[model samples]
Target chain A: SETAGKPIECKAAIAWEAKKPLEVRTVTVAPPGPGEVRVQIKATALCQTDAYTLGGLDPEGRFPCILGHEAAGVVESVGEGVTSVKPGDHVIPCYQAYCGECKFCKHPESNLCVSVRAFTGKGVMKSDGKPRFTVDGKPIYHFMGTSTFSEYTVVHEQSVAKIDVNAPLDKVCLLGCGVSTGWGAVFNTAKVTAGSTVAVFGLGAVGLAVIEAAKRAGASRIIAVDIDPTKFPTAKEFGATDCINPKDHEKPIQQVIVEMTEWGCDYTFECIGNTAVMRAALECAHRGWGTSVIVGVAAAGQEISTRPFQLVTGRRWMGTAFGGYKSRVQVPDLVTDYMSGATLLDKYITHNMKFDQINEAFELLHAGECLRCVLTF
Target chain B: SETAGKPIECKAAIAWEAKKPLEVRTVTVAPPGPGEVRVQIKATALCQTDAYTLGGLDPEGRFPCILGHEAAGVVESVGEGVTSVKPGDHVIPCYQAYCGECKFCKHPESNLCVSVRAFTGKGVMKSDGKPRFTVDGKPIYHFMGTSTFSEYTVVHEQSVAKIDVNAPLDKVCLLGCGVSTGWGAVFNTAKVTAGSTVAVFGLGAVGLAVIEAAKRAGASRIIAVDIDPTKFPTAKEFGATDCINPKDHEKPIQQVIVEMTEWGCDYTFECIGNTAVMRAALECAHRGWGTSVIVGVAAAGQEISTRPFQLVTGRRWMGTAFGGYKSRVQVPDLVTDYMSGATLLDKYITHNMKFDQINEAFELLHAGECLRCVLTF
Candidate 1:
């Protein structure tokens, strides 16, 4: 099945350290190890979490790591005992790999896999516990398991979710993280009830996805709050009935939200992890029975504070990791939802480019002109 | 009929100003008004809330107020339109008076009845919205509607709950507030599931009542925490499987509680209004899904602060007012539980005295020697 006898060396860019410019280098990829598979990545999206880790906002991040968490690809090779997918199978690589046995994986509330812990934050392969990529014999760590900046990468069998080959890779790759997280926050974490009022803060890719999901869940009044007025139209198109520009309001954003819902929304999702915004999301909830889900990842050592009476009055605050969905269980259903037209995944892919223009993809995101830029291999 | 011709003048202890000692004076009680009932209080319990309001802890308190919330009495007479109870019926007067038609009373969360507003803080009769007890033509405000300090007091018919005549009026009076608040924190607020682990902070009368209710709910581990070591035995007797003395540990009480529960208890109840303790109760919950119920009424204008991450991590923080029970609906059921041997109300009455010695009852509570001191008329 190999196109060439010679091993392929691919060019990739990575953030070696905090606040550092991207370093371009050639790295070698070996054939898949036992119980693993090699995938030729078709597209990957740069998310704020990837930037946060690169900016050292994530305290748990390791150095010399290859970035990019949102990725989709085709199976190029598979080692022995791999039965889920075969060569040419289209797949999306989920950052959260599940073993299906750990206490967390078995829990109804958690989507975290226990067996992936050794590789998730360690920046190493699960099998050998060593860095996979090497440039002139220098070890390079993988950011998350997928590390899709490179043309081809090795991942555990559990991490890759196979999808219909007919699905456009560039458009569907955005569903790998951002879209799923926001939609899942509404569907799984908050369980946005039918005809419920919903308020989503920060109308970025994730927040817009939340609005779409709320509409799908039958939310009647979808309120979007953002400091930038430019995002209002996009938010409305995604199903926001009301938009609040915080810059023009005299009171806090929460008070504005409370006024909109009469007593605040039944459900709220915090996509921006600003401490003040987090508190506002909690306080703006309808007293005695409102639920708020934290979908944003905040900076390390940054803590949120609020009066304990808020909880006593019946507001529930919770956070979702990977939208509280296991990759194997939820990714398939998410793809089904996309196919069934229950969710809008294609609308988030604002730009598409070749793998060679990966740096420009991140640049496009930082410019704020696009919601998500997908890099195709 | 008509054992006494006129309402007898009796000496009452009253607080004239914030943080001032109660003044003793003879006050006249007019006959019951329409829909009102006159209660010759046989016994009244001095509660922590009494001391709290008396010490200027309640921001809503009015001066020249009689400060007793928990009391049991013989119904001396029922005014026009009163049909619920007759004269000589043994009853306990609740602080929360329900007006069956008001929005709050109609709501499922009826413990926070707005109908009692006229009497709760203003210390007046609800019928005419005027002061019922007068000392030298000066109005003495009622505390929490049921100001049972004087031998006889007039209250709305909706406030009185009839009890078995056999149940000692002196002991049953403690259930008016302290016992009910504590027990409700467990039964109503925490809803302690069988085989669940429960941790109660501040083993005062409220905390102990929580322990008793925990036992009634079939909780596996009822843990009691207090700064004072002497309260351990009392807590254990009430149903606490383990006792934690915060003074014995170097770490904060929350940490200590977490250590005891291996991670943290499934549920925690805060009886002490101390802000720090309230925070400790919240933090000492299991990471994924533990709930903490706040029964302690913190000092006015003093707010609680905690990291929002605590809640986002799956710990729930909630507060309970009157154990989160609708007084009219729950009080009768609670009294039934006491009668049916499902709950313990007698053991909480640690001391008893005559109405003339009401000041001594407050002293016993201040000294911490008594869980509850009931004043008999």
Candidate 2:
């Protein structure tokens, strides 16, 4: 708490270069500037997107940066123009920031506010176009507008959602990214209706979260598809009515599903970030008014392709970023849901480790061994 | 309409083989069977599907007998169980047959009614699966559930749309195919809103109808795009704000459109039936919630391709058949529109011919020299 009004010396995991190991070192985090907030990050989770930038694949990703978006923390101090969150308020930093003033933010149907996207994606402050973190006074950049890899991170006030004080920072942290993203994709983006048939590809944390949401949407049939059979039990526990291993079928997974449902499912979702699975998800939709929402992020420059017949015959192909949730408006209510025990996050936490063990956490994630490894300060 | 109740031998065009010229000959048309009504054709227009079947491209097409579907006529006779229309009612034949009781037809969002499609698509009567027409005691096949190529044609009560008695058969016949398709694609499928920006690719009859519909939708700007400069003047007359020739720009047409509008158009329509154009139309949509509708008939086995990024960022891709309007329900209103000074389709009829000159109509249409060629008996 002593670091409240002044610059803080913090320990952060810095990716100095692409395809290189993170070097844990002491860095200086400047006090919040105007419209900014300095958060004392308490807990963070390692996600695939963080791994994607470290592997140097994201086209918009920049170098020498801190990378983490799924985290829960307390606001240590607020900048001159900040009014949303105050010191001591618990919050979750968001990668999908909404300034409430941009043209996109004003649009009720979209969550992509273009206000800080230009500089935020380039890993710099949009205000002064400078980095806030430095090692030995040498500047390091920002990432996705939310840099939580450090013990204390500076973020725009628009990038953090203040949550209920009763909510524990550790569990509600899941709502910061993956869990909320998948759940909202089904509940909000797809708008799955009661008694509709649904299919979810890839039984990872996101897919399971989607299954849970589909159940809540009153889906009559929830088909869980994955190559890994080990994920089936957890998927079934999460309300999957049917478990399908694509490797078990001779025909394409879509055709097999089509044969099972007669025409196809009322809705289908892509969660593995694989293009082949994306095409299959779209093709497996019913002949009329079937919708497929792409919730996964694929590698940069790689494309997903299909015959227009899928759409021409009454199917819709759509997608969601952050599950189409307006972070500032939706995240607090989401955290409240977690606090009231209406949302599940424990099933997603597979391992717990210290800040310095994030490299090992990535090793487990890359090997397809963990759902999520929470790294605490 | 005097050819009522009795068997009539009528002059019709028959395609006995693939890639063969239609042979005009006398064929016997039996009286309308139960649930059927026979039409005495007054005017018919040659469409691309006629050429498509004649060229042996349609995988489901069958050999022999009538080919036309875009036409208007008067009901000459009504069989038992027929009540929608009786003798002397003006009507237009619909290729897409729908029985309101079918599951698909019952749904307001769909036009595909499967009750008669099983047999109607196979070139036979939906009742007994037999041909109603014969040549020298040899049975001839039907096409698209409506064989308007014959001077006297028998169709199910569900396949005929009864129109206003005051509407002229020659003019309102445009409501049967291309014009209604483009108009409904805008009004029903895309539900284009007022003051939005619109784009239409291909300046054929369907594309021009889209332009007119866009104007009626109160679009602020309508961009008509095509490679042929000859189409620009007609497009301008149809309320196109700007005309673009893709060949004139070194950059891609979508890029040129995006640059011109700063953000791409709000709604786009592709009527060229080309896969490449479909992708371009999708890519040229505005970043936040642009919509693109596919209204073209592509060649068999061809596929459309695009990057998943297009859909993942709030753009939607959808397609429509018969403009998403139920034939029996919407066609009458469309005919009313043509009768009450609400729609324009006279510009579409560029060529007029007698039965003997119908072959020349196909030649002009195949060379892209005519939009729609109406033939009279």
Candidate 3:
């Protein structure tokens, strides 16, 4: 293979400052470093977390950052010792990079990898401790270690998981975060028992994926709860056996859930980060023994609270991130499932656009006009 | 055996009103009704919960009540269908009366029997929904179904667990609440794995008992934390491998516990009802995985708050009531262990007094001078 002449320059949408609108700029990309690989992102999905970080809800996120993480692309280059994937292999860039040797990575709960610290929130290259992309020699930070908003991005080899070449990159990109998180909340955290009742607290892409996953897991009755009545039909399409608009209920939504289940649902998922809604999700659970899983990322400094008696009386409270799945091990399988038609990935991507219209994609997300949006390179 | 007397009068102490001190008065004791038993109380332990109820801390407690739940006595008479225990048998009165038919009683987690509603807090007999004891022709409500504060009390046969007469009643009376609850929280709830690090937040009778039980469970490092430096030696005597006095430390006690355990303890018991202390106990747990057991009853209407990230990062919050053990099934075995020198019962009962000094016993409890006080009839 012949070496490239001029380094490739690509346009990327970036959050230059918190609460301010994103800006599009052309940035130069460098060759991969040792144990790093370059991926030409084919498709990228805009997630709520990205919007949150852009809107200043994520206090840990950095400014002047390329904002995109859910991405699927083909490996364009590989550095020394990068044996996991070769050039031309289709892969998904996982935000949670795993070292595979840390105590947490070795433990069964490998979903919480400690090695991502240098990558997450810091917005810099793990090896150089500096930004990879630059505009007129001015460095721009990475977002969630992936920076998939760029047409081409460099990442540690461990951050990308190879999938079947037959799988569509644009469709499977949704599996990178939102779909996996919702589905993982069901299969991994709640482990919703067979023929049991479940209530999902939001009808966004994540909530809809959870409903579909619960149906696949043999949940007998899947209930969808959201403030918006317009989401009920979409929820039903996603495998919800029932739907409730809390605004229409008189004695609180939890009370209604309790009455409907004759106790409460066997499991609940708080897909929204509203503390009051989280409490309602927990209280609506069966009094003697129900497990509530929180999937929403709340605003910084906000805390969840409840009476201790809730747990004392046999209820449990837990949380899930990335669907409690170790990305390196799970992403490939998720892509395989998407290929097998086990999961509905197309239904999740309600909107798609070219990379140049990235700001419009985010605007559609903010207006709730899209369940999820994919930006193609 | 022939009954000695029919409907004889007996001396009893009654709580005529909330916040008012209990008054000793003569009350009528009727013969046993169906499924009920008449017990001649030999010894009764004054627990902090009794004082808590008298102080109006328990929302479920009623006035004009006779206080006493931790009691050991002889079966003087038995009602129809009472075959578990007979006349002349020594027994312990468990506040949780089990019907052995309700869903909870049938499940392994039967410690929270639901059949005691009529007597557990209602202060009335289940059969007639009326007060069982009458003082000077005025109805006196029963406390925790036993009312062992009186010389003689009637109870349902399901509430009494027969034990060997060899166990001293005065020493074993403490086993009814504090001792059983402490031991159960360790053995049942936390399941205190061998060679694990455990930190107890309070050094009261229950907390000390948890220390003793942890010792028996073969915990490697049992750290006892308390505000009173004087209680450190007592905590050590109760098998605390290390003790910390928060008043003497500059940083928070939880930070000290984390420093002592290197990466925080494997198990932390929150025996203090303070919300701040509960948060400390939760935070001072192993990062990847730790179990924090909440054994203390917080004040009514107060809540516990924590960042959801703690749970997401793999720390679990659980609660244990009555030591997560069914009193009817565990009391007899606990008493047997007491007799066999396996469980420590004698070390917890630090004070002994006659029925006449019952008020003085409360004063000692309020002043924190007694680990436990036993009132002998």
Fraction of true contacts retained by every candidate, in order, equals: 0.34, 0.69, 0.41
- List candidate 1 segments past 4 Å from native: A1-8, A30-37, A76-90, A112-114, A126-128, A156-168, A259-262, B1-8, B31-37, B77-90, B97-110, B122-129, B156-168
True contacts kept of 2: 0.69
Error of 1 at A262 (Å): 4.5
Q: Compared to the true structure, candidate 1 yields what TM-score?
A: 0.90
Candidate 2: pairs in clash:
none
Best-to-worst order by TM-score is: 2, 3, 1
Question: Worst 10-residue stretch by lDDT in candidate 3 chain B?
Answer: B1-10
Give the TM-scores of the predictions, in the order they appear.
Answer: 0.90, 0.95, 0.93
Chain B TM-score against the true chain B, candidate 1: 0.94
Q: Candidate 2, residues B115-151: lDDT per residue as tens digits?
A: 7777778888877888788998888888888888989
Better of 2 and 3 by DockQ: 2
Clashes of 2: 0
Rank ordering of all candidates by lDDT, starting from the highest: 2, 3, 1
RMSD in Å for candidate 1, one decimal?
Answer: 3.4
Model 2 misplacement above 4 A: B1-6
- For candidate 1, write residues B1-377 as lDDT tens digits: 66333665876778888776677678888788888888888888788888999888777888887878788889888788999889989888988766677645665643556666656567788788886788777787888888888778888887888787777777678778888888877877667888889999888899998898889888999888887888998888888899888888899889888887776888899998888888888899776567888888787766676776776566777777777666656676777767787666777877767667767777888888888877765
